[PDB]
Amino acid sequence: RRTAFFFDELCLWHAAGPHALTLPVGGWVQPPAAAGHAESPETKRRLKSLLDVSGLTARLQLRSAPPASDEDLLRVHPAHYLERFKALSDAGGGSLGQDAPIGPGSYEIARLSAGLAIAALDAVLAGEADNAYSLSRPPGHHCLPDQAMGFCFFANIAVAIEAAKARHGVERVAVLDWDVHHGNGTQAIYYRRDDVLSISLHQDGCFPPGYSGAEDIGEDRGRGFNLNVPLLPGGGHDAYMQAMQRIVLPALERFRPQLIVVASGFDANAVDPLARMQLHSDSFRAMTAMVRDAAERHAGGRLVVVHEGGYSEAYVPFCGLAVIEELSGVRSAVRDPLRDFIELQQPNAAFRDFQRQRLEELAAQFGL
Amino acid sequence: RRTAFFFDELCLWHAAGPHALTLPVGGWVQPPAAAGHAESPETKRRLKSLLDVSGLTARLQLRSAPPASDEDLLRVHPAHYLERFKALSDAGGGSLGQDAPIGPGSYEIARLSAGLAIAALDAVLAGEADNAYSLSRPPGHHCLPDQAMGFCFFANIAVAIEAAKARHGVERVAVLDWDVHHGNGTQAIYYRRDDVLSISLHQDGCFPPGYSGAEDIGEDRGRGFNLNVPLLPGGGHDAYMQAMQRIVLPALERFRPQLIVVASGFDANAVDPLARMQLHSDSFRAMTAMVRDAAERHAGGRLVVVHEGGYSEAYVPFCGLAVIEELSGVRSAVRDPLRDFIELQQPNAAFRDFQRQRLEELAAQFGLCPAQPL
Numbered sequence: 001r002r003t004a005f006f007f008d009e010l011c012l013w014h015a016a017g018p019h020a021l022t023l024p025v026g027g028w029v030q031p032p033a034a035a036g037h038a039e040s041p042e043t044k045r046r047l048k049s050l051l052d053v054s055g056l057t058a059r060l061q062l063r064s065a066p067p068a069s070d071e072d073l074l075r076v077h078p079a080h081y082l083e084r085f086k087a088l089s090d091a092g093g094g095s096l097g098q099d100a101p102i103g104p105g106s107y108e109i110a111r112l113s114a115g116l117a118i119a120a121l122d123a124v125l126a127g128e129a130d131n132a133y134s135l136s137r138p139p140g141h142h143c144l145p146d147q148a149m150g151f152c153f154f155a156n157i158a159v160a161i162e163a164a165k166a167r168h169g170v171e172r173v174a175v176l177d178w179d180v181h182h183g184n185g186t187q188a189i190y191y192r193r194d195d196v197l198s199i200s201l202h203q204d205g206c207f208p209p210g211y212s213g214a215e216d217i218g219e220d221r222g223r224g225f226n227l228n229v230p231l232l233p234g235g236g237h238d239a240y241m242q243a244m245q246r247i248v249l250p251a252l253e254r255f256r257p258q259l260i261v262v263a264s265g266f267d268a269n270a271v272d273p274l275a276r277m278q279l280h281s282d283s284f285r286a287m288t289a290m291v292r293d294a295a296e297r298h299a300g301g302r303l304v305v306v307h308e309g310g311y312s313e314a315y316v317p318f319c320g321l322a323v324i325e326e327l328s329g330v331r332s333a334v335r336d337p338l339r340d341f342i343e344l345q346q347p348n349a350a351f352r353d354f355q356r357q358r359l360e361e362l363a364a365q366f367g368l
Numbered sequence: 369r370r371t372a373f374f375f376d377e378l379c380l381w382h383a384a385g386p387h388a389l390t391l392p393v394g395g396w397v398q399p400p401a402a403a404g405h406a407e408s409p410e411t412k413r414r415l416k417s418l419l420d421v422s423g424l425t426a427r428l429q430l431r432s433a434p435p436a437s438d439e440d441l442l443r444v445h446p447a448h449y450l451e452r453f454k455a456l457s458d459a460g461g462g463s464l465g466q467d468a469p470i471g472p473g474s475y476e477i478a479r480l481s482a483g484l485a486i487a488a489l490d491a492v493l494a495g496e497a498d499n500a501y502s503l504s505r506p507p508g509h510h511c512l513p514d515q516a517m518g519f520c521f522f523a524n525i526a527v528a529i530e531a532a533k534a535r536h537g538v539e540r541v542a543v544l545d546w547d548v549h550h551g552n553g554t555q556a557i558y559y560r561r562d563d564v565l566s567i568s569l570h571q572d573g574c575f576p577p578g579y580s581g582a583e584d585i586g587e588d589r590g591r592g593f594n595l596n597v598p599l600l601p602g603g604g605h606d607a608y609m610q611a612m613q614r615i616v617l618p619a620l621e622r623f624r625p626q627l628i629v630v631a632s633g634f635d636a637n638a639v640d641p642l643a644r645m646q647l648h649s650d651s652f653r654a655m656t657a658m659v660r661d662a663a664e665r666h667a668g669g670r671l672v673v674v675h676e677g678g679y680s681e682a683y684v685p686f687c688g689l690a691v692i693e694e695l696s697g698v699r700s701a702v703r704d705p706l707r708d709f710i711e712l713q714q715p716n717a718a719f720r721d722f723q724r725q726r727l728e729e730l731a732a733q734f735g736l737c738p739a740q741p742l
């Protein structure tokens with residue numbers, strides 16, 4: 001298997017103002033002695049370092065890309081959003097919204113991030129690679145057409161999908177979003193459309209806060225082409241496998257995608273500060289293995305994984321590495337040091353069964 | 369209310385080797401650019417800074433203490449453990465166990481940490497304060513008599529309780545441990561004893577990993593004087609209030625404690641990396657309010673809160689501040705910035721009810737009886 005890895009060093013240079021985790025500094029929030037921000041370069045930098053140090057980078061097609069053109073960005077975002085964002089980035093940073101701070105030059109870096117997503121889809125559709133991974137920072141899955149939220153400033157996946165349809169004429173795209181937070185940007189953008197199947201597994205009510213969304217199945221022609229799977233907080237491996245087996249794979253089986261795109265956040269991992277789920281690196285591996293199987297069935301193997309959230313400096317590198325091993329079919333020597341520990345922490349049988357019953361009920365609600 | 373605050377700057381100087389969160393550096397674990405360890409000074413340092421900046425410190429009795437004497441330590445720990453620990457600390461640090469790394473001079477700092485717990489109980493029992501908070505670092509609730517684990521090197525609360533019994537002759541002590549991890553050290557130490565009631569609320573199977581412990585109710589005379597409440601991961605405010613109302617308060621009501629000690633970790637907070645629970649600062653306030661009510665009933669108000677875990681730099685300071693406001697009865701101007709956000713993230717009704725049913729079933733297993741306070 002040829003796996004392309006889309007990365008650029010400059011994506012790691014996007015830096016907002018001082019924060020303690022998600023909280024802006026000022027008032028009662030003391031400035032951190034070190035930390036700085038949750039959506040930090042270091043999560044992505046350490047993944048990259050680990051891929052290098054593992055040898056895995058050497059077995060991938062390392063690519064950069066040109067930034068997203070205005071034509072590409074305007075397919076999703078109004079011109080007035082582009083100018084407003086540019087103006088603030090040029091002026092020296094600030095706030096595009098709450099949960100959406102930017103630094104100087106963040107406009108160019110976000111364009112680059114979107115560029116990498118564009119190029120990844122392009123490369124898989126052109127036959128240059130069997131599949132691809134885009135280390136896009138800043139992330140995109142929360143971004144609305146004219147509102148930045150959740151540290152997302154362009155809808156990277158939506159921009160990449162539109163450019164793919166415009167260039168190659170793909171008719172059925174499926175987006176599986178396994179970041180722990182609800183992918184509201186992707187849902188909004190394609191809510192009335194039947195050509196993009198949008199699936200989001202998320203922690204019930206995490207972010208956006210209090211949002212579950214199981215009833216929200218799409219409008220108009222999109223009715224039945226959006227699926228929200230709000231998992232109960234504290235769920236881990238089994239919860240996700242059940243969701244995949246009972247909702248995700250049946251949904252894909254009916255929709256017959258010609259391309260599969262994954263919005264892959266790793267903030268469902270068991271040590272993430274920004275969610276309450278219990279995934280380990282082999283959960284993401286198993287999910288990647290299942291989604292590759294479906295791409296081989298309907299899409300001729302065509303699969304793209306785009307990096308989204310993940311806030312554990314320590315553990316995200318291992319979770320992302322497991323995905324890329326599964327994509328490439330290359331197993332490195334790296335061994336997850338938390339795997340065995342996290343296994344022991346999983347929900348008990350009764351809690352698993354409670355979550356399982358809910359997923360069976362949701363499956364029936366969706367007609368699967 | 370007079371509230372004593374036991375703190376010493378030196379407790380913040382205990383530092384183990386390089387770690388990424390809980391993982392030792394080396395092998396496939398890259399050295400952090402900044403962080404260092406999870407059990408880090410900054411969580412405790414920021415709490416202290418906030419108390420200062422809020423004005424709250426000025427309304428408390430700020431105290432240090434002498435380190436724990438050998439006599440005090442030997443009541444819980446064998447001499448062989450003391451020498452072995454001292455030897456390694458003198459030698460320049462290393463590992464006392466896995467999940468128990470130490471730096472140079474950690475022996476003296478752990479003694480100090482235990483000293484502060486000793487002094488807090490002493491001060492409340494002598495009538496110097498109505499209640500007290502001990503900012504003990506390193507923590508103690510995992511420490512076994514001859515094994516350090518979970519970043520704990522002396523059983524601070526056990527040492528403080530034994531010194532209290534030896535000095536003052538208290539007969540019934542209750543320890544309520546609301547750190548998110550199972551307080552195995554406290555359980556082990558007092559497992560065959562009926563003079564110390566040990567209660568632990570924890571996330572089911574979190575740490576120690578895979579341990580639930582509901583069946584473990586004490587041995588011999590201790591049978592019925594140890595209670596484990598393994599809460600389902602993802603639980604928050606309501607889960608804890610139910611546990612308090614259905615298990616903790618009825619248990620205390622029957623046991624009639626003459627002193628209440630809280631092993632207060634804040635790692636059950638909703639942004640903690642080391643657990644999966646959803647508590648906010650007003651959950652800890654409400655728990656502190658409930659446990660003060662029980663101390664006023666049976667113990668003449670005598671309550672001590674000892675600081676344990678908590679790994680969110682950003683959020684722990686607010687959670688601890690809420691406890692100390694409740695202890696002192698002094699409300700500062702500080703407002704929790706995550707409170708409203710965390711409320712929206714709480715478990716849905718069906719999940720709450722599922723957890724509630726399990727606590728009712730656990731209550732019946734303990735034979736606990738839901739009477740109201742009297």
Ligand SMILES: Cc1nn(C)c(C)c1/N=N/c1ccc(/C=C/C(=O)NO)cc1
Pocket residue numbers: 022023024098099100139142150151179180181207265267274308309310705706709
């Ligand atoms: C700013 C701010 N201020 N406050 C008061 C709160 C509560 C704030 N942030 N909340 C957030 C914002 C974003 C996330 C996760 C994003 C992600 O995972 N993308 O995949 C989590 C919490």
Ligand SMILES: Cc1nn(C)c(C)c1/N=N/c1ccc(/C=C/C(=O)NO)cc1
Pocket residue numbers: 337338341390391392466467507510518519547548549575633635642676677678
């Ligand atoms: C995992 C893992 N894997 N390895 C290899 C190591 C050395 C690991 N440490 N795990 C731990 C150990 C202790 C805690 C205690 C938390 C606390 O709040 N005490 O109250 C949490 C995680």
Ligand SMILES: [K+]
Pocket residue numbers: 177178179180181182183200201202
């Ligand atoms: K999601």
Ligand SMILES: [K+]
Pocket residue numbers: 190191192193194196197198218222225226
């Ligand atoms: K759709």
Ligand SMILES: [K+]
Pocket residue numbers: 545546547548549550551568569570
């Ligand atoms: K506990």
Ligand SMILES: [K+]
Pocket residue numbers: 558559560561562564565566586590593594
């Ligand atoms: K006991």
Ligand SMILES: [Zn+2]
Pocket residue numbers: 179180181265267308309310
């Ligand atoms: Zn996310």
Ligand SMILES: [Zn+2]
Pocket residue numbers: 547548549633635676677678
């Ligand atoms: Zn703890």
